[PDB]
Amino acid sequence: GKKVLIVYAHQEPKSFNGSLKNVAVDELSRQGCTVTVSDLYAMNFEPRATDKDITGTLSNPEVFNYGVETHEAYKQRSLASDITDEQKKVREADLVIFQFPLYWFSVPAILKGWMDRVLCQGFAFDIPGFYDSGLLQGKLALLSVTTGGTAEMYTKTGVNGDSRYFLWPLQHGTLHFCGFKVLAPQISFAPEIASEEERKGMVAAWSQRLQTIWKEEPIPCTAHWHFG
Amino acid sequence: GKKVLIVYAHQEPKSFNGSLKNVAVDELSRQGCTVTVSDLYAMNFEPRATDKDITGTLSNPEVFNYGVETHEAYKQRSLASDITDEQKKVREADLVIFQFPLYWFSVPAILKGWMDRVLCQGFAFDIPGFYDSGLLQGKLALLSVTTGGTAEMYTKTGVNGDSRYFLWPLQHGTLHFCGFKVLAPQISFAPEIASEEERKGMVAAWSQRLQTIWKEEPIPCTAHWHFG
Ligand SMILES: Cc1cc2nc3c(=O)[nH]c(=O)nc-3n(C[C@H](O)[C@H](O)[C@H](O)COP(=O)(O)OP(=O)(O)OC[C@H]3O[C@@H](n4cnc5c(N)ncnc54)[C@H](O)[C@@H]3O)c2cc1C
Ligand SMILES: Cc1cc2nc3c(=O)[nH]c(=O)nc-3n(C[C@H](O)[C@H](O)[C@H](O)COP(=O)(O)OP(=O)(O)OC[C@H]3O[C@@H](n4cnc5c(N)ncnc54)[C@H](O)[C@@H]3O)c2cc1C
Ligand SMILES: Cc1ccc(NC(=O)c2ccc(CN3CCN(C)CC3)cc2)cc1Nc1nccc(-c2cccnc2)n1
Ligand SMILES: Cc1ccc(NC(=O)c2ccc(CN3CCN(C)CC3)cc2)cc1Nc1nccc(-c2cccnc2)n1
Ligand SMILES: [Zn+2]
Ligand SMILES: [Zn+2]
């Protein structure tokens, strides 16, 4: 049996993102998958990387270095419980779906904070132990993104550039760095200026794709895939 | 006379980022510039985009859309005071420096939240009124970034890819979209594994560059500059 974690970043249950999230829960649940949703805004999830994230005594009280102290805290089981709650979900998951609207060619800050705080050294990667040897190897990840801009604006000759250009920090710099195999992204362009039937169609496309998600091959997460 | 805003995202005053920020304050202050620092962690700056950001009544209580409601709130002077405090600093600034460590090939979530919440429609851009016609036109912006990875890892043939690849969402998708002219980024690679004298040199390089920052030409912020 499979475990899926959906890390969901939208304020509004009736939003288009909310519908994409609900559809994923329904379809995966129907398949028999174990499903967990981290509804970040509902959780009032803390995005800031601060010394409050380490519940043990710091190694160095003269100079605070977030990466160093969370790495040591992870080894000593001294991380704040909101972080370790999310680590448990990720550790058990076979597939992690991120469901979010694009904010400034990236994830909303609350989701950026989940990346910053949850994927610490010792947990998600180590040195050595990143990219193909990252510590989340054997898991799948997939970005389900919605945009303001249209598909045609997100091409090589459109004002926004190819949509693969903005995926690079998330897919390569984050997911692949932690050792995930990355499934092709689901990009739902410009729902706000689409018709209600068009929105209906983009939702159904997602639901349909999920019916056979476990049969998909990951993408080659390389500079060539993104910029070639 | 010139106004500079430094949006600074580091938890530790004695950090390498803290030193780069302090050097900027000292040098710009010595030049006679008006200098403001938004020390995000010290301000406990709120990164989450929520309905609390709108202090007026929502246009639509059935379905909450953050972009729509902040755009209307901006027009009606009904945004939370932490946002409008930052908008005042940006509105008056001639140069905005972002000083931050790279987190997951991007900005720390607290700074991502300052982008998400501060640069709202009507203020930073409109439709129409983006990229070259963005509403912050006539201002300069500059990213001062520090990394874990080495310069050689951040090349086309290194594991991280060229550093220009990760700059794309920040420089093109955000700064240029709002109409900033973008100065060449300052990238201080791998201070943590550099020697103390090397760190000293990278600090002095920044200080020296700032002596003539007002004489620099902006970069062409294009797909070609980033991926060419
Ligand atoms: C801070 C910020 C930064 C942004 N940065 C960018 C950027 O860099 N690039 C870019 O392109 N865009 C950007 N945007 C735009 C953003 O990506 C979009 O507004 C977002 O993707 C839209 O998704 P949504 O879920 O909120 O849509 P919604 O507004 O919720 O969707 C539209 C309508 O569809 C309805 N709906 C819900 N479910 C269904 C259904 N099943 N069938 C039919 N209709 C349904 C909803 O109720 C809603 O009224 C930014 C927005 C913000 C606020
Ligand atoms: C969540 C997270 C995500 C990350 N993601 C990435 C990523 O995607 N890519 C990547 O490359 N890296 C990443 N990193 C690494 C991160 O970018 C670095 O740790 C950061 O850039 C280092 O800067 P710092 O200011 O914290 O250095 P510091 O640790 O503060 O600098 C090193 C030492 O220099 C000292 N110092 C201060 N001032 C001076 C001075 N004037 N002269 C000499 N020494 C001085 C400090 O006190 C310190 O002890 C990530 C880190 C975290 C926590
Ligand atoms: C919340 C919202 C909803 C939709 C959009 N839409 C677009 O940004 C957009 C802009 C121009 C067009 C061009 N189109 C030409 C034809 N006429 C009829 C419509 C306009 C289409 C979509 C933005 C937002 N808000 C928003 N907020 C912050 C940043 C951005 C953003 C940033 C970078 C690139 N694109 C958008 N966007
Ligand atoms: C807080 C910190 C400080 C430094 C680094 N350093 C590096 O990630 C790194 C990794 C490998 C090398 C290779 N080097 C080979 C030679 N031997 C001697 C040293 C290792 C250098 C730097 C990471 C972190 N933490 C951190 N936390 C989350 C994500 C990332 C991150 C993400 C993507 C790419 N690079 C780093 N990094
Ligand atoms: Zn990759
Ligand atoms: Zn540009």
Author numbering:
A (entry chain A), B (entry chain A): 2 to 229
Publication excerpt:
We have solved the X-ray crystal structure of NQO2 bound to imatinib to 1.75 Å resolution, which shows that the drug is bound adjacent to the flavin isoalloxazine ring. The complex crystallized in space group I422, with one monomer in the asymmetric unit. The final model includes residues 3–230 of human NQO2, one FAD molecule, one imatinib molecule, one zinc atom, two (4R)-2-methylpentane-2,4-diol (MRD) molecules, and 213 solvent molecules. In our structure, the dimer is formed from two adjacent molecules related by a crystallographic 2-fold axis. The isoalloxazine ring of the flavin cofactor forms the floor of the active site, upon which the pyridine and pyrimidine rings (rings A and B) of the bound imatinib stack, with an average distance of ~3.3 Å between atoms in closest contact. The side chains of Trp 105 and Phe 106 form the back of the active site, while three hydrophobic amino acids from the other monomer in the NQO2 dimer, Phe 126, Ile 128, and Phe 178, form the top of the active site. Steric constraints prevent the bound imatinib from binding in an extended conformation, causing it to instead adopt a horseshoe shape that directs the methylbenzene, benzamide, and N-methylpiperazine rings (rings C, D and E) away from the active site and towards the solvent. The inhibitor makes no direct hydrogen bonds with the protein, although several water-mediated hydrogen bonds are observed. A water-mediated hydrogen bond is formed between Asn 161, which is positioned by a hydrogen-bonding interaction with Tyr 132, and the N3 nitrogen of the imatinib pyridine ring (ring A). The conformation of the imatinib molecule in complex with NQO2 resembles this cis conformation.
NQO2 is a cytosolic flavoprotein that carries out the 2-electron reduction of quinones using electron donors such as nicotinamide riboside (NRH). It is one of two closely related cellular quinone reductases (the other being NQO1) and is thought to be involved in metabolic reduction and xenobiotic detoxification, although its precise physiological role remains uncertain. Biochemical and structural studies have demonstrated that NQO2 is a dimer. Dimerization leads to formation of two FAD-containing active sites per dimer, with each active site located in a deep pocket at the interface between monomers.
